[PDB]
Design an enzyme around this catalytic site. Structure first.
Site, mmCIF file in Angstrom:
data_model
loop_
_atom_site.group_PDB
_atom_site.id
_atom_site.type_symbol
_atom_site.label_atom_id
_atom_site.label_comp_id
_atom_site.label_asym_id
_atom_site.label_seq_id
_atom_site.Cartn_x
_atom_site.Cartn_y
_atom_site.Cartn_z
ATOM 1 N N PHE B 120 0.859 -1.175 0.000
ATOM 2 C CA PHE B 120 0.000 0.000 0.000
ATOM 3 C C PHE B 120 0.897 1.226 0.000
ATOM 4 C CE2 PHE B 120 -4.428 1.504 0.796
ATOM 5 C CZ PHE B 120 -5.109 0.483 0.163
ATOM 6 N N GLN B 241 -7.995 15.245 2.185
ATOM 7 C CA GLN B 241 -7.263 14.290 1.369
ATOM 8 C C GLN B 241 -7.976 14.085 0.043
ATOM 9 O OE1 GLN B 241 -6.464 9.680 2.002
ATOM 10 N NE2 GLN B 241 -4.686 10.930 2.588
ATOM 11 N N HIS B 243 -7.973 11.438 -2.738
ATOM 12 C CA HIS B 243 -7.545 10.121 -3.168
ATOM 13 C C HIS B 243 -7.133 10.183 -4.635
ATOM 14 C CE1 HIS B 243 -7.502 5.821 -3.999
ATOM 15 N NE2 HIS B 243 -7.605 5.601 -2.700
ATOM 16 N N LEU B 253 -14.846 5.240 -5.493
ATOM 17 C CA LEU B 253 -13.450 4.956 -5.197
ATOM 18 C C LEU B 253 -12.990 3.685 -5.900
ATOM 19 C CD1 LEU B 253 -11.020 5.743 -3.154
ATOM 20 C CD2 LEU B 253 -11.741 3.591 -2.089
ATOM 21 N N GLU B 256 -6.597 1.917 -3.813
ATOM 22 C CA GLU B 256 -5.143 1.951 -3.919
ATOM 23 C C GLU B 256 -4.541 0.552 -3.921
ATOM 24 O OE1 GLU B 256 -1.997 3.753 -0.768
ATOM 25 O OE2 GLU B 256 -3.096 5.272 -1.912
ATOM 26 N N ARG B 287 -0.416 9.785 -0.998
ATOM 27 C CA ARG B 287 -1.549 10.224 -1.806
ATOM 28 C C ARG B 287 -1.477 11.706 -2.147
ATOM 29 N NH1 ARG B 287 -6.514 7.161 1.345
ATOM 30 N NH2 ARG B 287 -6.145 5.078 0.451
ATOM 31 N N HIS B 354 -11.891 12.582 -0.488
ATOM 32 C CA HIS B 354 -12.007 11.219 0.015
ATOM 33 C C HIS B 354 -12.030 11.123 1.540
ATOM 34 C CE1 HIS B 354 -11.463 6.945 0.415
ATOM 35 N NE2 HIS B 354 -10.247 7.081 0.918
ATOM 36 N N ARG B 398 -2.908 11.347 5.349
ATOM 37 C CA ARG B 398 -3.101 10.010 5.890
ATOM 38 C C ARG B 398 -2.548 8.962 4.936
ATOM 39 N NH1 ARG B 398 -7.030 6.018 5.250
ATOM 40 N NH2 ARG B 398 -8.458 7.429 4.145
HETATM 41 C C1 LIG Z 1 -15.204 6.943 1.586
HETATM 42 C C2 LIG Z 1 -14.213 5.819 1.757
HETATM 43 C C3 LIG Z 1 -13.370 5.816 2.860
HETATM 44 C C4 LIG Z 1 -12.442 4.793 3.036
HETATM 45 C C5 LIG Z 1 -12.346 3.740 2.093
HETATM 46 C C6 LIG Z 1 -13.199 3.752 0.996
HETATM 47 C C7 LIG Z 1 -14.130 4.772 0.811
HETATM 48 C C8 LIG Z 1 -15.044 4.748 -0.398
HETATM 49 N N1 LIG Z 1 -11.450 2.724 2.240
HETATM 50 C C9 LIG Z 1 -10.640 2.706 3.303
HETATM 51 C C10 LIG Z 1 -9.708 1.665 3.494
HETATM 52 O O1 LIG Z 1 -9.648 0.740 2.653
HETATM 53 N N2 LIG Z 1 -8.880 1.635 4.545
HETATM 54 C C11 LIG Z 1 -8.964 2.634 5.443
HETATM 55 O O2 LIG Z 1 -8.207 2.639 6.444
HETATM 56 N N3 LIG Z 1 -9.848 3.650 5.302
HETATM 57 C C12 LIG Z 1 -10.679 3.716 4.271
HETATM 58 N N4 LIG Z 1 -11.592 4.775 4.124
HETATM 59 C C13 LIG Z 1 -11.678 5.837 5.142
HETATM 60 C C14 LIG Z 1 -12.546 5.228 6.243
HETATM 61 O O3 LIG Z 1 -13.371 4.180 5.705
HETATM 62 C C15 LIG Z 1 -13.487 6.215 6.912
HETATM 63 O O4 LIG Z 1 -12.815 7.438 7.193
HETATM 64 C C16 LIG Z 1 -14.006 5.590 8.196
HETATM 65 O O5 LIG Z 1 -14.649 4.351 7.874
HETATM 66 C C17 LIG Z 1 -14.969 6.476 8.971
HETATM 67 O O6 LIG Z 1 -15.551 5.666 9.993
HETATM 68 P P1 LIG Z 1 -16.307 6.367 11.217
HETATM 69 O O7 LIG Z 1 -16.824 5.305 12.143
HETATM 70 O O8 LIG Z 1 -15.372 7.406 11.793
HETATM 71 O O9 LIG Z 1 -17.536 7.156 10.522
HETATM 72 P P2 LIG Z 1 -18.501 6.520 9.385
HETATM 73 O O10 LIG Z 1 -18.198 5.047 9.194
HETATM 74 O O11 LIG Z 1 -18.505 7.451 8.201
HETATM 75 O O12 LIG Z 1 -19.932 6.612 10.095
HETATM 76 C C18 LIG Z 1 -20.449 7.855 10.551
HETATM 77 C C19 LIG Z 1 -21.543 7.480 11.543
HETATM 78 O O13 LIG Z 1 -22.003 8.648 12.229
HETATM 79 C C20 LIG Z 1 -23.401 8.619 12.361
HETATM 80 N N5 LIG Z 1 -23.917 10.009 12.353
HETATM 81 C C21 LIG Z 1 -23.497 11.008 11.572
HETATM 82 N N6 LIG Z 1 -24.229 12.130 11.829
HETATM 83 C C22 LIG Z 1 -25.119 11.808 12.790
HETATM 84 C C23 LIG Z 1 -26.190 12.546 13.515
HETATM 85 N N7 LIG Z 1 -26.473 13.852 13.280
HETATM 86 N N8 LIG Z 1 -26.908 11.882 14.440
HETATM 87 C C24 LIG Z 1 -26.617 10.594 14.647
HETATM 88 N N9 LIG Z 1 -25.686 9.876 14.050
HETATM 89 C C25 LIG Z 1 -24.914 10.465 13.110
HETATM 90 C C26 LIG Z 1 -23.897 7.847 11.142
HETATM 91 O O14 LIG Z 1 -25.069 7.085 11.421
HETATM 92 C C27 LIG Z 1 -22.765 6.895 10.840
HETATM 93 O O15 LIG Z 1 -23.062 5.617 11.411
HETATM 94 O O1 LIG Z 2 -8.380 5.465 2.169
HETATM 95 C C1 LIG Z 2 -7.840 4.384 2.491
HETATM 96 O O2 LIG Z 2 -7.406 4.190 3.644
HETATM 97 C C2 LIG Z 2 -7.702 3.311 1.397
HETATM 98 C C3 LIG Z 2 -8.474 3.412 0.269
HETATM 99 O O3 LIG Z 2 -9.388 4.359 0.052
HETATM 100 C C4 LIG Z 2 -8.242 2.362 -0.811
HETATM 101 O O4 LIG Z 2 -8.589 1.182 -0.616
HETATM 102 O O5 LIG Z 2 -7.697 2.727 -1.864
#
Ligand SMILES: *Cc1cc2c(cc1C)nc1c(=O)[nH]c(=O)nc-1n2C[C@H](O)[C@H](O)[C@H](O)COP(=O)(O)OP(=O)(O)OC[C@H]1O[C@@H](n2cnc3c(N)ncnc32)[C@H](O)[C@@H]1O
Ligand SMILES: O=C([O-])CC(=O)C(=O)O
Ligand SMILES: CCCCCCCCCCCCCCCCCC(=O)OC[C@H](COP(=O)(O)OCCN)OC(=O)CCCCCCCCCCCCCCCCC
Ligand code: HEM
Ligand SMILES: CCCCCCCCCCCO[C@@H]1O[C@H](CO)[C@@H](O[C@H]2O[C@H](CO)[C@@H](O)[C@H](O)[C@H]2O)[C@H](O)[C@H]1O
Ligand SMILES: N#C/C(C(=O)c1ccccc1Cl)=C1\NC(c2ccccc2)=CS1
Ligand SMILES: CCCCCCCCO[C@@H]1O[C@H](CO)[C@@H](O)[C@H](O)[C@H]1O
Ligand code: SF4
Ligand code: F3S
Ligand code: FES
Ligand SMILES: [K+]
Lengths: 102, 611, 240, 139
Positions: B120, B241, B243, B253, B256, B287, B354, B398
Site C-alpha cells: 500500500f 485528502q 484520493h 473509489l 489503492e 496520496r 475522500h 493520511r
Molecule cells: C469513503 C471511503 C473511505 C475509506 C475507504 C473507501 C471509501 C469509499 N477505504 C478505506 C480503506 O480501505 N482503509 C482505510 O483505512 N480507510 C478507508 N476509508 C476511510 C474510512 O473508511 C473512513 O474514514 C471511516 O470508515 C470512517 O468511519 P467512522 O466510524 O469514523 O464514521 P462513518 O463510518 O462514516 O460513520 C459515521 C456514523 O455517524 C453517524 N452520524 C453522523 N451524523 C449523525 C447525527 N447527526 N446523528 C446521529 N448519528 C450520526 C452515522 O449514522 C454513521 O453511522
Molecule cells: O483510504 C484508504 O485508507 C484506502 C483506500 O481508500 C483504498 O482502498 O484505496
C-alpha cells in the site's frame, strides 16, 4: 424427536421418490401389490403436500386447527375409498387401463 | 410544540461506523449502561464502503516491526501528526486486527493460513531504507464491508441500547462540561435528550462539502458541527485528502490496492509518469504527492478522455485470477459505472475528495481537548474517535489503510479511558429544564422555512465553491475569493426554502440540517486554508511552496536561529465559528513530538519528505 | 435535444390525517441526469418535489440503503440503469409487502431482528484466547465463504419471496438464512450443530419452497436459494 | 437492550395498531417463468389430490361399479378428437407435476441452482410435459 422437522422433510422426499417409481411399476407390473402401494403413497404424499399448503396460507390458532382436522378426515376417507376400490372393484391399475380403452 | 423524551445512561455514543461500534460495545463490555445514537442503520455507515484494508505489522508476508509502521505514519503525516497518538495506534495495531479476525472477520488468507496483507502507498521496511512493506490486511477489496459487518455482528452480544435513525442536533453543555446530546427521532418525529456522564462523538467525515467526492451522501460532518456550535475548536480542517483514483464521472473509489497489486497510472502518451515524480515509490507514493502529480499532468495538456480531464489506471497486465481474487469489488464497480472491463481496458480516474485529516481535537486517550493560553485542557465528559476526531494520527496526510485502524484503536481507547476514569452507575449529571431548546427552535424554523433559495440550491453553490477554490492546488487570491463567496452563502442561509412540513421522515428537513453542518465545516476548512501560508501534506499553496518548520530542517541544525511559534507553521490549526455571523476565528497549538516511550520508540524529528 | 422520461412513484404521508397512497408522476430530462434511477430520485427531490422521501447513502451499491421495487423488481436504485425508452413510464414502489413508514421507506425492524436471532458472529467453545493470536484458516476453507459474506443486507431477496410475504413473522427469509449458512460453514465456528438445531420447526427454514425469486432479484448477484438448499441437506444428515 | 424475540413483538404490536399501509406486492411484482412454473406445480398438485379424493369418494358412494360407468361412456360413441382432448386434459396435470417434481428433487440434492440453469430445466420440463401428454393421450 428433536430432529422432527428435518425428518419430515426427508420423509416427504422419500415418499415422492417412491411414488415416482410406482408409475413405471403400475405400467410394468399392474396388480394388487402396486394397487395398494399406490393407494398408500397417493394419500400420504397428498396429505403432506396439502399440509404445506395449509401451513403456508392458513393463519390463527383456530383456523389452523380446523384446516388440519378437516384435512385429516379427507385423507383418512381417501385412503379407505382407495382400498375399497382395490378390494371390491378392479383396482387402480385396471381402472386406468379401462378408462384409456374408451 | 414538540414532545421531549428524556433518557439517562452512563454513556452515549454518537455514530455507528467502525469507531462508534467499537466504542459502544466496548463500554457495555465494561459494565456501562451505554446508548448508541445513529442517524443510519449501523451497516449503512460509510465504513461499509472501505476497500483496501487495515494496516498492522503482523509479519504474515515478511518480517515486520510496528515501529517501522510508526515511522511511515509520522513521515506520511508531514510532521503534523502527534507522535504519541501514532505510537499508540501503530503499536496496538497487531492486537486490533487480531481482535477483528477473532470476531470472525473473513480475512483473505496466505498459504500458511494467516491474514493476507498487500502493499500500500508509502509503506516501507527498515525505517524507510528497506524497501516496500506488505502490512495492509484485507478482505479482498471489501475490507470495510467485512469490518463493519463483523463489528455489528459482535455488537449484538451486549446490552447496548441502540437508537437507530436518530439525528443528533447538539451537545448538552453545562459549565464547560458535556452531559449528553439532544437528538431527533426520525421515525415518529420526537425530540430525545440523552443524559450521560460521558459522550463519544464518532460521526464520520464531511467529504460532501465538495462537488465530487468518494464519500457517501451521509458524510455531512454532523458531529464536527455540534462541537463548533458548542463553542469548542476544530483542528486542521484545511487538510482534505484527495484520493488519487476516484472513478471519473461518478467519483466512486477505486482502491489503492490496485496499485498495491501491480496497477500503474498512465497519462495520454502511455507513460507510467510516477516513475518521474517518485522514482523510488512510483505509483505507491503518498496520496498527496500522487494527486498533485496527476493534477499537474492534466493542466499541462496530457489528460485522457475526449476532454483531457482525467488519467488512466491500468490493470490488464495483471493475471485475471489475481484481479478476481484480490480485486473483485472494483472489477464490478468499474463495469457498472464506467463500462470498463479491467482485464482489457484501463479505468478512468482522477483525484477526488475522500477523507478529512482534520476534525475534533483529542489527545491519545480519545478525550476531546481545548486550548487556553498555550495548554491543552480536557473537556470533561466529551470524547471523539474516528474520522470525526483529530488525534492527530494523520497530521497533514493520511497513509492508506490507516483510517480503519484508527477507528478500532481509538474507539476501544475511548472505552478504556472512561472505564479507568469513571465507574458505572455513578450519578447521571442533571441538566437545565430547557436544555437543548435552541436545537428545537432551529429545527422548527427550518421545518417551516419559506424563503427564496431551496436547500438543494444552497448545497450546490457550497460544493462548487469548495471545488473551485480549495482543490489540490491553492493560491491566496483564489482562496480569498472563495472565502467571501462562502461567507456570502452562509449569510444567505437566512433565506432558505423548504417544502416538506411533516415531521416523520422529513428528509427535506434533515438535509437542511446537514447543510448547516456542512457549511460550518466548509468555512473552517477554507478560512484555515487561506491563513496557512505554507505547503504541507495535502495542503498545497503555490504562493508558499515550502514547508515552514521551527527550523530549516534541510541544513544542519548547528547554530540555527529557532523561529518563534508565531513565525512558523509546524503547528495545528484551531478553528472556531460564531454561528450567528459565520465569522471564523483561528488559533494554533503545538504538535506533540514525544512518543509514549522514547526508549521503546524514538521520536522522529522533521526531515525532508520525498518518495 | 431533451429526452423527457416519466417516472410514477408511490406516495404516502403519515403526517397527513386521512392521506391515501397515490402514484405521483414526474418528468426528467435524461440529458441532464445521471444514468441510474437514484440519480433521478435525487434530481426529482432537489428540483421538483423536496418532499419525496427515500433511503440512500453510498450511491455505489455497497451499503444497501436504497433497495426498492423498480419496474416490477427489487433492486438498488443506485446500480439500476434508467430505462431510456421514453415510451414506457418507470413505476417505483417500496419493498413489497412491508409496512410503509413514508413514501419509499419501509419498516425493516423485523428483518433486522430476524438477523439478530441467528447470532451472526463467530462463536467458539473456548473463547478464553480471544484476541491473542489470529485463528488459522486455509485458503480453501476461506474460499467457501465467497458468495456468502458479500451480502449487504438490502432485503431485496426476502421481500421478493412469496413465503416471506405470507409468513414473514416466522419464516426467516433468504437473506437471514444465507447468513446462517455463512456461519455454519465457517471453519472457525464451533456451533454448527447448534445453528442447525435452531431451524428445527415448520417455519424458520422450511417455508422455503424453491421459488427462486430471491436469487433472480439479488443486486449483488448472490444465490440465497442455493444456500438454503445446502442448509436443508445439512439438516437431514447431521447427527446429534 | 432488547432481545430479537422482543423486537419482533414490538414490530407487530406497533404496526398492526398503526395507520401505516402495506406496500403492494401481487399487483405490482414482475412475473417470471420460474414463478409461474412454481404456482403451476402447486395448482396441479392440489388438483390431482382433489381428483384422487373425489375418485375414492365416488367408489364409496356410487351405486354402480367402475365397469358400468366405462360401458356407459363407450356407448355414447364420442368423437376420437374429444376422447383425445379429454385424455390430454387428464394427463397434462399429472405430466407437468411429475416432471417438475423431478426438478424439485434435483434441487433438493443441491443441483441446478444457477439462475440460468433454473430457466433451462424449466423449459425442459415444459417440452417433456407436452411430449409425454400428447404421446399418452394418443394412446
Ligand atoms: C469513503 C471511503 C473511505 C475509506 C475507504 C473507501 C471509501 C469509499 N477505504 C478505506 C480503506 O480501505 N482503509 C482505510 O483505512 N480507510 C478507508 N476509508 C476511510 C474510512 O473508511 C473512513 O474514514 C471511516 O470508515 C470512517 O468511519 P467512522 O466510524 O469514523 O464514521 P462513518 O463510518 O462514516 O460513520 C459515521 C456514523 O455517524 C453517524 N452520524 C453522523 N451524523 C449523525 C447525527 N447527526 N446523528 C446521529 N448519528 C450520526 C452515522 O449514522 C454513521 O453511522
Ligand atoms: O483510504 C484508504 O485508507 C484506502 C483506500 O481508500 C483504498 O482502498 O484505496
Ligand atoms: C386430475 C387427475 C386425477 C387422477 C390422478 C391420477 C393419479 C394416479 C395415477 C395412477 C397411474 C397408474 C398407471 C396405470 C398403468 C396401466 O396399467 O396402464 C395400462 C394402459 C394400457 O396401455 P396399452 O395396453 O399399451 O394400450 C396402448 C394403446 N392402445 O396404459 C395407459 O394407457 C397408461 C395411461 C396413463 C394415464 C394416466 C392418467 C391418469 C389420470
Ligand atoms: C399423484 C400425485 C399427487 C396427487 C400429488 C400431489 C401433490 C401435492 C398436493 C403437493 C403439494 C403442492 C405444494 O406444496 O406446492 C405436491 C408437491 C410435490 N410433489 Fe406431488 N403429487 C403427485 C405426484 C408426484 C410425483 C410423480 C412426483 C415426482 C411428485 C413430486 C412432488 C414434490 C417434490 C413436491 C414438493 C413441492 C415443494 O417442495 O414445494 N409428485 N404433490
Ligand atoms: C400451463 C402452463 C403453466 C406455465 C405457463 C407460464 C406462463 C407465464 C410465464 C410468464 C413469464 O414472464 C416472463 O418470464 C421471462 C422468463 O423468465 C422473464 O425474462 C427475464 O428473465 C430471464 C431470466 O434471467 C432473462 O434471461 C430475460 O432476459 C428477462 O427478460 C420476463 O421478465 C417475464 O416477463
Ligand atoms: N411462486 C409462488 C407463490 C406461492 O404462493 C407458492 C407457490 C408454490 C409453492 C409455495 C408457494 Cl408460497 C405465489 N406467487 C405469487 C405472485 C403473484 C404475482 C407476482 C409475484 C408473485 C402469489 S403466490
Ligand atoms: C391453492 C389454494 C390457495 C388458497 C388461498 C386462499 C386465499 C388466502 O387468503 C389470504 O391468505 C394470505 C396468506 O396466505 C393472507 O395474508 C391474507 O390475509 C388472506 O386473505
Ligand atoms: S442476498 Fe442479495 S438481495 Fe438478499 S440481502 Fe443480501 S445482497 Fe441483498
Ligand atoms: S424466493 Fe423464497 S421460497 Fe426459497 S428459493 Fe428463494 S427463499
Ligand atoms: S445507496 Fe448504498 S446501496 Fe444504493
Ligand atoms: K480526522
Amino acid at each position: 424427536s428433536s430432529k422432527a422437522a428435518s425428518l419430515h422433510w426427508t420423509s416427504e422426499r422419500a415418499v415422492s421418490a417412491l411414488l415416482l417409481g410406482l408409475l413405471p411399476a403400475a405400467y410394468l407390473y399392474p396388480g394388487p401389490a402396486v394397487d395398494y402401494s399406490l393407494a398408500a403413497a397417493l394419500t400420504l404424499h397428498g396429505h403432506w403436500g396439502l399440509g404445506q399448503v395449509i401451513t403456508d396460507y392458513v393463519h390463527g390458532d383456530t383456523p389452523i386447527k380446523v384446516a388440519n382436522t378437516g384435512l385429516y378426515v379427507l385423507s383418512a376417507i381417501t385412503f379407505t375409498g382407495l382400498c375399497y376400490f382395490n378390494y371390491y372393484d378392479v383396482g387402480i391399475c385396471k381402472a386406468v387401463a379401462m378408462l384409456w380403452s374408451i | 410544540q414538540y414532545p421531549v423524551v428524556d433518557h439517562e445512561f452512563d454513556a452515549v455514543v454518537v455514530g455507528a461506523g467502525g469507531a462508534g461500534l467499537r466504542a459502544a460495545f466496548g463500554l457495555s463490555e465494561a459494565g456501562f449502561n451505554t446508548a448508541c445514537v445513529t442517524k443510519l442503520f449501523p451497516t449503512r455507515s460509510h465504513t461499509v464502503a472501505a476497500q483496501g484494508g487495515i494496516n498492522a505489522a503482523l509479519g504474515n508476508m515478511e518480517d515486520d516491526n510496528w515501529r517501522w509502521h510508526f515511522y511511515d505514519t509520522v513521515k506520511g503525516s508531514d510532521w503534523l501528526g502527534d507522535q504519541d497518538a501514532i505510537h499508540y495506534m501503530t503499536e496496538q495495531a497487531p492486537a486490533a486486527v487480531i481482535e477483528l479476525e477473532n470476531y470472525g472477520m473473513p480475512f483473505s488468507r496466505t498459504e500458511e493460513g494467516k491474514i493476507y496483507q498487500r502493499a500500500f502507498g508509502g509503506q516501507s521496511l527498515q525505517f524507510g531504507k528497506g524497501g516496500q512493506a506488505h502490512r495492509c490486511c484485507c478482505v479482498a477489496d471489501r475490507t470495510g464491508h467485512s469490518l463493519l459487518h463483523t463489528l455489528y455482528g459482535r455488537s449484538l452480544r451486549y446490552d447496548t441500547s441502540y437508537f437507530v435513525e436518530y439525528f443528533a442536533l447538539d451537545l448538552l453543555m453545562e459549565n464547560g462540561e458535556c452531559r449528553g446530546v439532544i437528538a431527533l427521532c426520525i421515525e415518529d418525529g420526537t425530540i430525545h435528550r440523552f443524559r450521560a456522564k460521558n459522550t463519544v462523538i464518532a460521526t464520520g467525515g464531511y467529504g460532501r462539502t465538495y462537488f465530487s467526492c468518494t464519500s457517501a451522501h451521509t458524510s455531512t460532518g454532523d458531529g464536527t458541527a455540534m462541537v463548533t456550535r458548542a463553542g469548542l475548536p476544530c483542528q486542521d480542517l484545511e487538510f482534505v485528502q484527495f484520493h488519487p483514483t476516484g472513478i471519473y464521472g461518478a467519483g466512486c473509489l477505486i482502491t489503492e490496492g490496485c496499485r498495491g497489486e501491480g496497477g500503474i497510472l498512465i497519462n495520454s502518451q502511455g507513460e507510467r509518469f510516477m516513475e518521474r515524480y517518485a522514482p523510488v515509490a512510483k505509483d505507491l507514493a503518498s496520496r498527496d504527492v500522487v494527486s498533485r502529480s496527476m493534477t499537474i499532468e492534466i493542466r499541462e495538456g496530457r489528460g485522457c478522455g475526449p476532454e483531457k480531464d482525467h488519467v488512466y489506471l491500468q490493470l490488464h497486465h495483471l493475471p485475471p485470477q489475481q484481479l478476481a481474487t484480490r480485486l473483485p469489488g472494483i472489477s464490478e464497480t468499474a463495469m457498472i459505472f464506467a463500462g470498463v472491463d479491467v482485464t482489457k481496458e484501463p479505468i478512468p480516474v482522477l483525484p477526488t475528495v475522500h477523507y478529512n485529516m482534520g476534525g475534533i481535537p483529542t489527545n491519545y486517550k480519545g478525550q476531546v481537548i481545548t486550548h487556553v493560553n498555550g495548554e491543552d485542557k480536557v473537556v470533561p465528559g466529551l470524547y471523539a474517535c474516528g474520522e470525526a476526531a483529530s488525534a492527530s494520527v494523520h497530521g497533514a496526510n493520511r497513509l492508506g489503510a490507516n483510517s480503519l485502524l484508527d477507528l478500532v484503536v481509538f474507539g476501544r481507547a475511548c472505552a478504556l479511558t472512561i472505564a479507568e476514569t469513571c465507574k458505572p452507575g455513578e450519578p447521571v449529571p442533571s441538566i437545565k429544564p430547557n436544555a437543548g431548546e435552541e436545537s428545537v427552535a432551529n429545527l422548527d424554523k427550518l421545518r417551516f422555512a419559506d424563503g427564496t433559495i431551496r436547500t438543494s440550491e444552497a448545497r450546490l453553490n457550497m460544493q462548487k465553491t469548495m471545488q473551485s477554490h480549495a482543490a489540490v492546488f491553492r493560491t491566496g487570491s483564489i482562496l480569498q475569493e472563495g472565502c467571501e463567496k462562502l461567507s456570502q452563502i452562509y449569510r444567505d442561509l437566512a433565506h432558505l426554502k423548504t417544502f416538506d412540513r411533516g415531521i416523520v421522515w422529513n428528509t427535506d428537513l434533515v438535509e437542511t440540517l446537514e447543510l448547516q453542518n456542512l457549511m460550518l465545516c466548509a468555512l473552517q476548512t477554507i478560512y484555515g486554508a487561506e491563513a496557512r501560508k505554507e505547503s504541507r501534506g495535502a495542503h498545497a499553496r503555490e504562493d508558499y511552496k515550502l514547508r515552514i518548520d521551527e527550523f530549516d530542517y534541510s541544513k544542519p541544525l548547528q547554530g540555527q536561529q529557532k523561529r518563534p511559534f508565531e513565525e512558523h507553521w509546524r503547528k495545528h490549526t484551531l478553528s472556531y465559528v460564531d454561528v450567528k455571523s459565520g465569522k471564523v476565528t483561528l488559533k494554533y497549538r503545538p504538535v506533540i513530538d514525544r512518543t509514549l516511550n522514547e526508549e521503546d520508540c524514538s521520536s522522529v524529528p522533521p526531515a525532508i519528505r520525498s518518495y | 435535444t431533451s429526452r423527457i422520461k416519466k417516472f410514477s412513484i408511490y406516495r404516502w404521508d403519515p403526517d397527513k390525517p386521512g392521506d391515501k397512497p397515490r402514484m405521483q408522476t414526474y418528468e426528467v430530462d435524461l440529458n441532464k441526469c445521471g444514468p441510474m434511477v437514484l440519480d433521478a430520485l435525487i434530481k426529482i427531490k432537489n428540483e421538483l418535489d423536496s418532499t419525496l422521501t427515500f433511503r440512500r447513502s453510498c450511491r455505489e451499491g455497497i451499503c444497501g440503503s436504497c433497495a426498492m421495487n423498480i419496474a416490477g423488481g427489487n433492486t438498488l436504485a443506485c446500480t439500476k440503469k434508467i430505462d431510456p425508452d421514453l415510451s414506457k413510464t418507470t413505476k417505483i414502489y417500496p419493498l413489497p409487502h412491508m409496512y410503509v413508514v413514508k413514501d419509499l421507506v419501509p419498516d425493516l425492524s423485523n428483518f433486522y431482528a430476524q438477523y439478530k436471532s441467528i447470532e451472526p458472529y463467530l462463536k467458539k467453545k473456548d473463547e478464553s484466547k480471544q484476541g491473542k493470536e489470529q485463528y488459522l484458516q486455509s485458503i480453501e476453507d476461506r474460499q467457501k465463504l465467497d458468495g456468502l459474506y458479500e451480502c449487504i443486507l438490502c432485503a431485496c431477496c426476502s421481500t421478493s419471496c412469496p413465503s416471506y410475504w405470507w409468513n414473514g413473522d416466522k419464516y426467516l427469509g433468504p437473506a437471514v438464512l444465507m447468513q446462517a449458512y455463512r456461519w455454519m460453514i465457517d471453519s472457525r465456528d464451533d456451533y454448527t450443530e447448534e445453528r442447525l438445531a435452531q431451524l428445527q420447526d415448520p417455519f424458520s427454514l422450511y417455508r422455503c419452497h424453491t421459488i427462486m425469486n430471491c436469487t433472480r432479484t439479488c443486486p449483488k448477484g448472490l444465490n440465497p436459494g442455493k444456500a438454503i438448499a445446502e442448509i436443508k441437506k445439512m439438516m437431514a444428515t447431521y447427527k446429534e | 437492550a432488547t432481545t430479537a424475540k422482543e423486537e419482533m413483538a414490538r414490530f407487530w404490536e406497533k404496526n398492526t395498531k398503526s395507520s401505516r399501509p402495506l406496500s403492494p406486492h401481487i399487483s405490482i411484482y414482475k412475473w417470471s417463468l420460474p414463478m409461474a412454473m412454481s404456482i403451476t406445480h402447486r395448482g396441479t398438485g392440489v388438483a390431482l389430490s382433489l381428483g384422487v379424493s373425489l375418485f375414492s369418494l365416488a367408489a364409496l358412494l356410487l351405486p354402480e361399479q367402475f365397469p358400468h360407468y366405462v360401458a356407459v361412456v363407450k356407448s355414447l360413441s364420442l368423437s376420437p378428437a374429444l376422447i383425445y382432448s379429454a385424455k390430454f386434459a387428464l394427463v397434462f396435470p399429472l405430466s407437468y407435476h411429475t416432471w417438475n417434481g423431478i426438478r424439485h428433487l434435483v434441487w433438493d440434492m443441491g443441483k441446478g441452482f444457477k439462475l440460468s440453469q433454473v430457466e433451462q430445466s424449466g423449459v425442459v420440463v415444459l417440452i417433456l410435459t407436452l411430449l409425454s401428454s400428447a404421446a399418452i393421450a394418443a394412446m
